[PDB]
């Protein structure tokens, strides 16, 4: 009721990251497993095409964060990269909506058509961004993203309340579980622990007085 | 004095990476010599996980112009501890040849190296902008972005040596020029100081010491 459990798809910034609904979590890897089937396809299939632009949406054939080899990725094209001294072609920046990692630097030989099913299939990442606070500055600086993370491998499970959405995201507080395991005739107890105000009190962030 | 140089790849006005043109051809040769060897060892070694801070290796990895992953002579900068969202131990290499730093590269890409093979003095010669710093803390991505820029805004580029700290070598980077005048006399040079550039633009700050 309160509480909504999580899998932590993938974290960029405290404003910034991605998660699923547990259950859902093997339909996730079914989609991902049926999108190579039909990137490949695509891309021997079609013809050479070099005119991709900002939200062209794509298939592409990148390495994410947790990957030993690259994989085919649903993708919107987020940045376009022109030719360098370092590197003499066009490149793009890519968004992976399964995923939610922005990916720089990949070759248009990386990218492949979309069909039009692949498109509208809702993305796997879910948005949210930690309610009620901001950096200490312009932007999250490593130190606090680095706590973040820690913040997140610390704890058993992690959960979510909703505290509204912005335009792509939703506004949450962040719960970390332990459980405390009191003997065999009695069933663990579960405590939960604000993340939010974990990063406040740390000094790794403000509260936002944009917020109610 | 002026010596050309080629730019192999750039990560802040004082980190960027360069080599003596004529050099080139034999930059390449060591390049597909590396994918041999490297191939050879990964299917030949007993897996390792071992892998410490200052190790020489192999890595196979997609550096910044690559459109495939391949395999690059290394050192390991870094040990990235498993996270939430990657369970697995991962480490960040710094390319001897190339330059670049790469995040995140899995155990199973990494590979030994021999030593004959390891002691080849690297392809890349470190390079800092002398006489200049950040304004703010860090090289500001604005800065960055104009320094980029610069480089591909010019014929040639050549560097002037004014000293050496025990890694890299500062330099005054010059970006030329060439002015056609007709067919009967010979084209003219002339020579942009970048690092000024940067200065005049406002995109850095001198350095006074």
């Given at each position: 009721?309160?509480?909504?459990?999580?899998?932590?798809?993938?974290?960029?910034?405290?404003?910034?990251?991605?998660?699923?609904?547990?259950?859902?979590?093997?339909?996730?890897?079914?989609?991902?497993?049926?999108?190579?089937?039909?990137?490949?396809?695509?891309?021997?299939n079609m013809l050479p095409?070099?005119?991709?632009?900002?939200?062209?949406?794509?298939?592409?054939?990148v390495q994410a964060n947790?990957?030993?080899?690259?994989?085919?990725?649903?993708?919107?094209?987020?940045?376009?990269?022109?030719?360098?001294?370092?590197?003499?072609?066009?490149?793009?920046?890519?968004?992976?909506?399964?995923?939610?990692?922005?990916?720089?630097?990949?070759?248009?030989?990386?990218?492949?058509?979309?069909?039009?099913?692949?498109?509208?299939?809702?993305?796997?990442?879910?948005?949210?961004?930690?309610?009620?606070?901001?950096?200490?500055?312009?932007?999250?600086?490593?130190?606090?993203?680095?706590?973040?993370?820690?913040?997140?491998?610390?704890?058993?499970?992690?959960?979510?309340?909703?505290?509204?959405?912005?335009?792509?995201?939703?506004?949450?507080?962040?719960?970390?579980?332990?459980?405390?395991?009191?003997?065999?005739?009695?069933?663990?107890?579960?405590?939960?622990?604000?993340?939010?105000?974990?990063?406040?009190?740390?000094?790794?962030?403000?509260?936002?007085?944009?917020?109610?």
């Amino acid at each position: 009721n309160k509480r909504t459990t999580v899998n932590i798809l993938y974290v960029r910034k405290p404003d910034e990251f991605y998660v699923t609904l547990p259950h859902f979590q093997k339909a996730i890897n079914n989609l991902q497993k049926s999108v190579q089937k039909a990137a490949a396809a695509m891309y021997q299939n079609m013809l050479p095409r070099t005119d991709w632009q900002v939200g062209d949406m794509c298939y592409a054939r990148v390495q994410a964060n947790c990957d030993s080899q690259a994989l085919w990725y649903r993708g919107v094209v987020t940045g376009v990269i022109p030719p360098g001294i370092t590197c003499p072609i066009v490149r793009y920046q890519v968004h992976l909506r399964d995923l939610g990692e922005l990916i720089d630097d990949v070759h248009s030989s990386s990218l492949a058509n979309i069909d039009e099913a692949d498109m509208r299939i809702s993305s796997s990442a879910k948005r949210c961004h930690l309610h009620g606070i901001r950096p200490i500055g312009d932007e999250w600086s490593k130190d606090a993203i680095d706590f973040f993370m820690d913040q997140l491998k610390a704890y058993n499970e992690i959960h979510v309340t909703g505290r509204g959405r912005t335009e792509n995201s939703l506004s949450v507080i962040l719960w970390g579980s332990l459980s405390i395991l009191t003997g065999p005739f009695s069933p663990a107890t579960i405590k939960y622990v604000n993340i939010n105000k974990a990063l406040l009190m740390a000094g790794m962030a403000e509260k936002d007085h944009n917020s109610d």
